[PDB]
Symmetry: C5
Subunit: 307 residues, 5 copies
């Protein structure tokens, strides 16, 4: 095969969309291989810019196509340089930009720890005609700098693997496996905004719904529970544009569900307390002892849910 | 005709839009036919990449156009390989991406069972000049993996049919029918998020509206019913961005309508109960027996609506 | 002139945007005229596909440009076939897709009856050098099938007219009028979703605002009227993303205005009833007789507004 | 210089975005100058269509570039005709579409009177090599027809001026000033929808907040004022998607601010009235005389704000 | 190297998106260098327009590529002029438009003071083959004019620096550092709309939550605090589309948090006041002295938060 070396530079990572589970990466790509020696004007290396490289392509120069596997839509490419050293090596420098997608788990919403994946693979040649030797990723711009709500940590891990595509086996008998470069950038979500925007106001609404039991009569605390129901519905709205639809439950949605359960349990408990009077003579305080036991059990439920 | 074999590979299915009734599919398409034997440099097959295939097209090579019938907009094509074996067969490999639309019924919203359809058809040649022999679809990437809220099950069924277009009969006398490939991927919606987001809170609001009848006087339970009306209006909003406009009623909208009917029936029943006093001496408890009969009838209504 | 025949096929009509007053139409266009006899390889007709037709255009072939007058943006064209019979006729087949706009009246919102208009006109030649003979529109796909909330009825009416453009009269002395094809598809809005989403809940809120008059004291029914005011404001929001800004009033906005008028009339009537006491001794029941007259007058107002 | 005459035809003006302060204009542009006499096939004028004009451009024909100065993004051009009379004049007909921006003042929101501006200017040649002689604008399609909420009045005024660009003075010593065509279409906003959607419901909320003073005790009218506060907050939302952020205040936002001021002034006045009792014996009616003076002063404030 | 002079003209700055932290800049770019003397038709300088410059590029003319480093997506370029003086200098004039991004700090939201940065850098040549001599930026259009909510002050500062890219060091041994032009436009946010839209209504809600303590009994002031809680939740929504997610807290979000803290502190204080009665005989006024001390402490907290 023809040995190809890749050097991916990353300019910035921006536009992290946690709802669509995509992110947008800017930077440059530098491929480099070795071919037959050629003649260039003078000892200086030759530069071929964009919209004129096609003359060299039709002239007979072997130039591979690099595509990104996990991209959404076409990569919005810009400039492309094909510079030619006269000793033989051909360097293809291009600027890439596109929306990349990943699995992006959400088992813990506010304290999330994710990774950003770039997968690079030639479109045409299998690994017996183009093998990737190595990649060095220079993430010097975003090495320890904070992007939106994400605090990037560590270097970018590199890997080379041989992926196999079975759909090409109808036309290629044996040699139909492709060279993979995957580039991983670990990213940890910064939980501060969520900490002072959702989990603390929801806990305070939980305490306000706890404080229903301190009342003295029926209709006043039913109206208190109903106007607490309305504001729990209000916080049920604000999470609709913060995470997508998930099969499981995150921290915030479990807290919403716990709030609904606590308020309707309080309403059912007060309804049962009023229903305890068979003839309208019995006082209702014996079941009203959960002023100092419902918060303890709810705290225990939260403590179990933490671990 | 010229026999053409298709092998569609599917990379991922993403961006399922249940409101616009479209979905976006990434993957590759591999067409293959057989032509006259040709001379290639060496015994190796020849590779022609993108933006240089037009030289072979103007040079005189017969290369069909594959279009997707059910696509929204132009398919955002990327790379395209035309590789040439020297024995005669010509292989057209291309990467396709676009928004496909389907009928996408919504008789049951949270427990939906849909399918994803890809329809492939040549743009120019009728079946007497291009007949599709077979298709093998390799859905190995999404075979049993979960995409957003959709849990994909089974393989992808394949079919070949001859569709007929009457609009072309003005220029072609008899032979004006086209070759169809349809590819079907069955998909079942995962009902968990809806189960703990809409149907359970709405049932709890239904029980809260049931609990109006336990009060003792007029204005307190009218205010209770009105503040329950307000939060049913609040849940009437949250469904406005979850399904499109439908002629029929789904489960969730029938539950909204049932909630409105139950609350206004309670208000009318209490209004009638107060209106029962002709001279202000009659007690109002005889019609107030629906504390243990309105939930039973409402449960029966729900049970009828289930089947 | 050169006689041109058009056969427009319509694949589907989708993405009906009632706010922007545009709609998106997919399908094919087939133009056909007659020219000088030519020589083709063999007795079979010649096929010229996309991205190679420009060789025949620069070679000297007369091929008109068909544009859509009422389009928003450029029509997102795809494939284009120029097939050549050897007897002389030249057929230009193209696939068109774009957002078309129309007047789209809204005098009755839920029971709307609209039409979809496609206007076709050559860009360059006036009717003395290109005259449209006839059009046959094959709307076989959407002939009696329901698209989103629109139930399409009937065939598509056809017309040929000669439109005149005065702006071209500065450069052409007399012959400056163009050939028009307009294609009309009548469409009736299906009122079911609106019937069980807006007009019925609003009428029930109207009845709830009627039920204010059954109370016995002041502040309780003022609070009842205010919490009904809040939910009428809540329904004033839901119509903000269903129709655009109109100079006139539809059914639903007239019902909103009637709800505001009824609630504030009830508040003013109760304020006047309390203000009737000059010295705090007079009872307030004489003006409170509108329990059985305000619904009758409001029903009469609705009955007048219907016709 | 070379004298150029322009005839701009306007098809429709649509998509008026009052938030982004842009609007979208469809129509055609017709440039015309005079050059050397040429030979054409026959006495008929020659027509050159799109995607073949570049042969005449590379062949040596002088064809200027017309750009729109106030455009947002590139103008989405479509067809372009370059027709050649054999006497010498060369006519460049093109179809233009793009988002144009203007200052778009908002001192009076519902009774706005704006204008739509098209600025046309050559990209390359200064006025000593291309001078615009005149423009005639044919606004016959939208001459007295209503677009969305805008009622277009009058003709379109025309102007020719010589704009000067200082940034080009580094490379051109003296002659560096360009020819301007500005085309102005006056447009008056139709205030009906706003009249029955915002200013009337807000005045009715103002009257409802006036009616707090008719109560007899404390907590009932505090709760009345608070539930009026909530619905004034509700109307504070609906204006967030109707106008952009402005440094000044429009009519509707001044009415919101007046509503907040009136409600909190009522709350402070009632708080002061309750605080007037030093020992709990004094009656609170002397300061409660603003039942018939607060509306008069508020009407006077509105009357001052009108002029 | 080849000395290049740049003159950037700025037409307007529009579409400032404070959520995505990007802004869109229109204007022109004028590059200029000096090459070998050439022959042109006549003594006049030669003009080469768009879509014909590629003939001169393939003909052998050295023309650099100018890219913007901090751009989001490809710059939506339009026309491009390459004018040739016959003495030797070659001028490349182009029109640029794109979304540029910057750090855009938000430590003070309503009284923000930001800057707009344009970074220009050649794509291919390092500073030993293309060195930027100077830039003069002509910001004459937006010199002291107000764009949306931003009041632009001062001139645009200019700078030339030599940036170094390590990712290119794999292919270039020593000389791998690029020439930077950065152009800075200082911009101050106009705080008026925020002043009368958020900070004043929130302070008035704060005073309304202060006025809870003037009541006489329990359930009335609990209901007052709960209906104030609901409208603080309502203002918690309106800030969700005004700034993005930030790790820190701005002025408005600190005011929201202070409002939540004050209301729940009032609820806890009243709960403690009711809980002070061990046997139901003690009066609750001793802890109710914060009618004139809670506003003072809250004002002190605000005063500390200001500096
Ligand atoms: Na909303
Ligand atoms: Na009460």
């Amino acid at each position: 095969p023809v040995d190809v070396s890749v050097s991916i530079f990353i300019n910035k990572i921006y536009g992290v969309n946690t709802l669509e589970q995509t992110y947008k990466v800017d930077g440059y790509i530098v491929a480099q291989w070795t071919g037959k020696p050629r003649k260039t004007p003078g000892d200086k290396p030759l530069i071929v810019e964009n919209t004129q490289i096609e003359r060299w392509i039709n002239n007979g120069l072997w130039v591979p196509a690099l595509e990104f596997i996990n991209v959404v839509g076409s990569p919005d490419t810009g400039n492309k340089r094909l510079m030619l050293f006269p000793d033989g090596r051909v360097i293809y420098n291009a600027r890439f930009l596109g929306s990349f997608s990943n699995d992006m788990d959400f088992r813990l919403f506010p304290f999330d720890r994710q990774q950003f994946v770039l997968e690079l693979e030639p479109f045409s040649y299998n690994n017996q005609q183009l093998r990737f030797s190595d990649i060095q990723v220079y993430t010097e711009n975003i090495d320890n700098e904070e992007i939106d709500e994400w605090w990037i940590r560590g270097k970018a891990s590199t890997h080379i693997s041989d992926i196999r595509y079975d759909h090409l086996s109808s036309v290629q008998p044996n040699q139909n496996e492709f060279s993979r470069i995957t580039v991983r950038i670990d990213a940890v979500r910064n939980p501060s905004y969520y900490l002072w925007s959702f989990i603390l106001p929801l806990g305070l609404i939980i305490a306000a719904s706890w404080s229903v039991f301190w009342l003295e009569s029926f209709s006043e605390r039913l109206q208190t529970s109903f106007t607490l129901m309305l504001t729990v519905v209000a916080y049920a709205f604000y999470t609709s544009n913060i995470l997508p639809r998930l099969p499981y439950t995150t921290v915030i949605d479990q807290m919403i569900i716990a709030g609904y359960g606590s308020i309707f349990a309080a309403i059912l408990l007060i309804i049962f307390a009023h229903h305890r009077q068979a003839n309208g003579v019995e006082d209702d305080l014996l079941i009203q002892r959960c002023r100092l036991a419902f918060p303890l059990g709810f705290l225990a439920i939260g403590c179990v849910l933490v671990i």
